[PDB]
Amino acid sequence: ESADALFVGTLDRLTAEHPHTDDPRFAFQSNQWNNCELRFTQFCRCTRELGEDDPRCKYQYYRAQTVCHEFLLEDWMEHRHRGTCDLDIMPDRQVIHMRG
Template sequence: INTATMAYGGIPKDIENYVSAPYDPRFPNTNQTRNCYQNFIDFHRCKKVRGEDFEACKYFKRIYTIICPNAWIEKWDEQIAEGRFAGKI
């Protein structure tokens, strides 16, 4: 029994189902910039081939939305829409 949790009425709803990105052996260091970028690229490649509702595509999207700063995601999405994104998708 966790008395600290009980004293405050349980776990708050906004963190009850919190999930962090799992360990990826391709990116063992603390700096997760490459991990962020790679999952962003992997999502868009997967979406192009399989569609956004494919389970693996959802996984890549979930990981990059956890790891990447929102400003980067917005910037990259804007670049993709304008046809000037540097990555190969």
């Protein structure tokens, strides 16, 4: 309700209420690749917590589509289904802190 409610809670909310507008974290740059990757990671984390059938995660996918072209999503969604998507590996099976 509050006028600044969107900024309150998360920076994510801003684009969730206005899907086709600039995200505060990426509005400074015309290139929106990083924006797409954040949105996909957020869809991946939603399903892990709520499942695919949850309306929330379905909307997190619509939000990802708003910024990600279909040819990228289809490829990244196949990697996710196989279990090779680097944005969805469970954190205890990551290797980012190993050997350096």
